[PDB]
Design a protein around this nucleic acid. Structure first.
Ligand SMILES: O=C1Nc2ccc(Cl)cc2[C@@](C#CC2CC2)(C(F)(F)F)O1
Ligand SMILES: [Ca+2]
Ligand SMILES: [Ca+2]
Lengths: 540, 410
RNA sequence: AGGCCACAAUAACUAUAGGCAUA
DNA sequence: TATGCCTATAGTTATTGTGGCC
């Protein structure tokens, strides 16, 4: 009475009518012996010229799976060992007769038909069809889990003190009871599964507490990954770097200090499978220190619902952040490596907030509650940025912690114009033909300077003009520009390699005492702005 | 019972479930178990590929958790049923009233059975913490809250029960949208509360079960320009930049005489006296901002758009339009007074208030343009959300010029 | 006669909204 | 109206890799 699940096909196609491959005879003699045993057990049944559908046997259901209907996800996101609870005794159960115990929908059974190769030149042959769930089928793990969940329900209600997790065929059972009480309850679970015809290993055949699951070596009190050993010195190829990044990203969940950006910069190149990309001194520098991190063995800690979650942020470099989540000090649950400056530039404060937002969402999936943050930023700086910024955000609980690399807001522009300060009207113009541009400034005192540039755009020339306006000016400066682009960048705090010019302007503004910056509409006949525009667009 | 079919070509809703907190999931399990025993929803297997997002909200009167299902995706695929086949009529006299009271009648749809073949499209999944359990699956057996077809089917039974109320009060206007009921009246403060209860007591006859609006008080506040005694170059330059951008909204605005005040290079502090032409241009520009602009009309064939800007210090401004620079309704939602308010809460309170105003005047939910990140909004919006509707939103960038213009609005 | 799940990197298609420049 | 050059918001399909599985 294992309750069959009704399964249909996709709207506009019948089952696979694919023919068999040439006979071998070396494999046929073995296949008959296996199929007869499956027929005797009741897994498959004989059919004649009735069934038009056919499936090739190596059984490859590649054509049928495309024709079979879509099933809802079995398990999309995999459980993280940090989200699991600490248990006294743990037991795993490898289920035999998994897909064999659960029967298939009778009407669908005709689509799973397969024909055995002949003995001597296309002789009639023997035909079979699956009465139960077949291996390598789309709906096989979906129905099996759905059937298993209904079986475990009465046991879960009777035993809420114990925790049972189901994965594919294997079952993970854990409790806080003594080793004597725990061992007895597993046998009671086995007898319940044996009712439906599910074979499970006995006490002596059961695996010991070091479980290997999804690459993780699990323990009742702690968890660790399998030792990561990588090929070393000699000049490696392009995909060997991709294999190295894959191992470092895999280690980033437990090892806190991992830097992978320089290897990602080498993979920014395209094409050849054997390019043999050499290393830069800065690339091997972060690679050599990552070897030191992977030397000493580390372990993760399980989640406790009583204690609060605490996350800490550190700025390790240019567009790189590292976080470690812990309930107890020095006892880390999970680490990360967030460095997602998406090829852009951004800043320091917003980029930190983008880091916080990723962990907040991560904690909802894993633990189910929001963690308390300890950020390397003062409340004075946080309030100043988010009041002047257009984008809204909210971090409910966060505290201040002084770390060696503090997040620092460099400069702030004046809200009102400065008295006695020299006024600088500024403008830049360029043409995309030949790529020539001019940048200049005109003051109220009379002084002016115009320069010419090579390989430049309108965005670069306007940015060069303000650089000249800060180069020749005093301490208190009033700068007027007609660009929304040039105003928008300086009003933000670009903490990146936004190319040469931007880093020079930021460095200039730190040296100055007070700077006021204003915007005017272009080509409107405004005094000051009109005089500069005629000079920069003289030959353009 | 009534047969329901999808729009030809399109399949059912297949949307990913957004992760929920440990407290919210346990609250949803308690509600879903109650509804399963009542015969509202039933468990279904993995053979159903269709999915609908589910969120947990909180109420004020009930004080307990409420189940919210996001049918936004499915409603786009079943739009021919509740708009063309069974459309709800909308009057143009609801927007003019003294007092409007809103009531929730969402429990009324929990009795009328749903079509057998259409039951599979209302499937939703309850997520698990760290994916320990496979995830609990359910589908609606009756008319669900948040689905546009529910008021369309009940419409034939809704008009017959409101007939004794409509015949009693001919001058009083009533309108139904989704799970909320809108009643407008020109009666007094003490009269309004009693007449609503008369309809509320009538609901109990059929068996089913500080919030008061003033649509006449939604008068559009005009944009006022700074009244200054002495003008400087910097004061003109900020004004010209804002007015030149506003020329595409209000065509009557000109900056020609104000620009002639700036002759040659001048300091920002330099005091410029206003001439006969400059004063007369600025004064007429103030008159254009006070009087409503021509060429602004509602179009039923086009979708409505709503854009909100953050001004800071607990101030938010908004615009309702169908085409850019042509606003049908403007204003500013400052803050819900004092207590506990953040950037998300003030925005959440604004969106709900703008949506409610959109239903009274037009009867359609606008496309929301929000100055917030997608990941930030989708996590915290459920905390302060109360209404059953779900407006279609997008996340965009806020220009500096549009932010500085609408803060001059009174 | 490799596919599926999680994460990451590279590439490509970007789409929408606003803006500047030239035509 | 087109293309090149800027900002912001949001995605999609392919490859490769790491950890796993059928
Ligand atoms: O809540 C947890 N605690 C736990 C702790 C250690 C181990 Cl090794 C296993 C668990 C467990 C889980 C497991 C599935 C991930 C494999 C257990 F399956 F129930 F065992 O449940
Ligand atoms: Ca454009
Ligand atoms: Ca792969």
């Amino acid at each position: 009475p294992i309750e069959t699940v009704p399964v249909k096909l996709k709207p506009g196609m019948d089952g696979p009518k694919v023919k068999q491959w040439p006979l071998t005879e070396e494999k046929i003699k073995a296949l008959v012996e296996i199929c007869t045993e499956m027929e005797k057990e009741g897994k498959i049944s004989k059919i004649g010229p009735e069934n038009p559908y056919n499936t090739p046997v190596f059984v490859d259901f590649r054509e049928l799976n495309k024709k079979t209907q879509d099933f809802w996800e079995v398990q999309l996101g995999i459980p993280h060992p940090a989200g699991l609870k600490k248990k006294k005794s743990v037991t795993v159960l490898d289920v035999g007769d998994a897909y064999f115990s659960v029967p298939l929908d009778e009407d669908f059974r005709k689509y799973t038909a397969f024909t055995i190769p002949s003995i001597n030149n296309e002789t009639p042959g023997i035909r079979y069809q699956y009465n139960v769930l077949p291996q390598g089928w789309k709906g096989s793990p979906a129905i099996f889990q759905s059937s298993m969940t209904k079986i475990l329900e009465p046991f879960r209600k009777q035993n809420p003190d114990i925790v049972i997790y189901q994965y594919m065929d294997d079952l993970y059972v854990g409790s806080d009871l003594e080793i004597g009480q725990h061992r007895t309850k597993i046998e009671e679970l086995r007898q319940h599964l044996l009712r439906w015809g599910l074979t499970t290993p006995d006490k002596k055949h059961q695996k010991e507490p070091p479980f290997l699951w999804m690459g993780y070596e699990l323990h009742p009190d702690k968890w660790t990954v399998q030792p990561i050993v990588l090929p070393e010195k000699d000049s490696w190829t392009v995909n060997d770097i991709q294999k190295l990044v894959g191992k470092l990203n895999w280690a980033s969940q437990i090892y806190p200090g991992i830097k992978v950006r320089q290897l990602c910069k080498l993979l920014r190149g395209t094409k050849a499978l054997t390019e043999v990309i050499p290393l830069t001194e800065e690339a091997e520098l972060e690679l050599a220190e990552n070897r030191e991190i992977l030397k000493e063995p580390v372990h993760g800690v399980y989640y406790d619902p009583s204690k609060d979650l605490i996350a800490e942020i550190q700025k390790q470099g240019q567009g790189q952040w590292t976080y470690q989540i812990y309930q107890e000090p020095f006892k880390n649950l999970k680490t990360g490596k967030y460095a997602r400056m998406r090829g852009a530039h951004t800043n320091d404060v917003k980029q930190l907030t983008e880091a916080v937002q990723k962990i907040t969402t991560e904690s909802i999936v894993i633990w189910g509650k929001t963690p308390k943050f300890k950020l390397p930023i003062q409340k004075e700086t946080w309030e100043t940025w988010w009041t002047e910024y257009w984008q809204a955000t909210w971090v409910p609980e966060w505290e201040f912690v002084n770390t060696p690399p503090l997040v620092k807001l460099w400069y702030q522009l004046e809200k009102e114009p400065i008295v006695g300060a020299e006024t600088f009207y500024v403008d830049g113009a360029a043409s995309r033909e030949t790529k020539l541009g001019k940048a200049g400034y005109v003051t109220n005192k009379g002084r002016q300077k115009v320069v010419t540039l090579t390989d430049t755009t309108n965005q670069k020339t306007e940015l060069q003009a303000i650089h000249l306006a800060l180069q020749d000016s005093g301490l208190e400066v009033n700068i007027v520009t007609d660009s929304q682009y040039a105003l928008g960048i300086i009003q933000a705090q670009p903490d990146q390699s936004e190319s040469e010019l931007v880093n020079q302007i930021i460095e200039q503004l730190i040296k100055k005492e007070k700077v006021y910056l204003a915007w005017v509409p272009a080509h409107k006949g405004i005094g000051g702005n009109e005089q500069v525009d005629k000079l920069v667009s003289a030959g353009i | 019972t009534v047969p329901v079919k999808l729009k030809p070509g399109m399949d059912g809703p297949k949307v990913k479930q957004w992760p929920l907190t440990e407290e919210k999931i346990k609250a949803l399990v308690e509600i879903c178990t109650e509804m399963e025993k009542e015969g509202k929803i039933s468990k279904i297997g993995p053979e159903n590929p269709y999915n609908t997002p589910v969120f947990a909200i909180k109420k004020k009167d009930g004080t307990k958790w409420r189940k919210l299902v996001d049918f936004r995706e499915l409603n786009k695929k079943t739009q021919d049923f509740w708009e063309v086949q069974l459309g709800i009529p909308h009057p143009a006299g609801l927007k003019k009233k003294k007092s409007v009271t809103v009531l929730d009648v969402g429990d009324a749809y929990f009795s009328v059975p749903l079509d057998e073949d259409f039951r599979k499209y209302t499937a939703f999944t309850i997520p698990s913490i760290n994916n320990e359990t496979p995830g609990i699956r359910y589908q609606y057996n009756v008319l669900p809250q948040g689905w546009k077809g529910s008021p369309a089917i009940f419409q034939s039974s809704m008009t017959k029960i409101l007939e004794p109320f409509r015949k009693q009060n001919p001058d009083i206007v009533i309108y139904q949208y989704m799970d909320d009921l809108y009643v407008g009246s020109d009666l007094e403060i003490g009269q309004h509360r009693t007449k609503i209860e008369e309809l509320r007591q009538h609901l109990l006859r059929w068996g089913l079960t500080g919030y008061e609006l003033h649509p006449d008080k939604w008068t559009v506040q005009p944009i006022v320009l700074p009244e200054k005694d002495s003008w400087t170059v910097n004061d003109i330059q900020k004004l010209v930049g804002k007015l030149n951008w506003a020329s595409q909204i209000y065509p009557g605005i000109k900056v020609r005489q104000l620009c002639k005040l700036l002759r040659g290079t001048k300091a920002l502090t330099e005091v410029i006296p206003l001439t006969e032409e400059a004063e007369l241009e600025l004064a007429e520009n103030r008159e254009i901002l006070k009087e409503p602009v021509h060429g602004v009309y509602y179009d039923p064939s086009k979708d409505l758009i709503a854009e909100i800007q953050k001004q800071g210090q607990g101030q938010w401004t908004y615009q309702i339009y169908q085409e850019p620079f042509k606003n049908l309704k403007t204003g500013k939602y400052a803050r819900m007074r004092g207590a506990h308010t953040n950037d998300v809460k003030q925005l959440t309170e604004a969106v709900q208030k703008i949506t409610t105003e959109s239903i009274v005047i037009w009867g359609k939910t606008p496309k929301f343009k929000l100055p917030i990140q997608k990941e930030t909004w989708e996590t915290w919006w459920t905390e302060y959300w109360q209404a059953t509707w779900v407006p279609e939103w997008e996340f965009v960038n806020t220009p500096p010029l549009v932010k500085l213009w609408y803060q001059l609005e009174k």
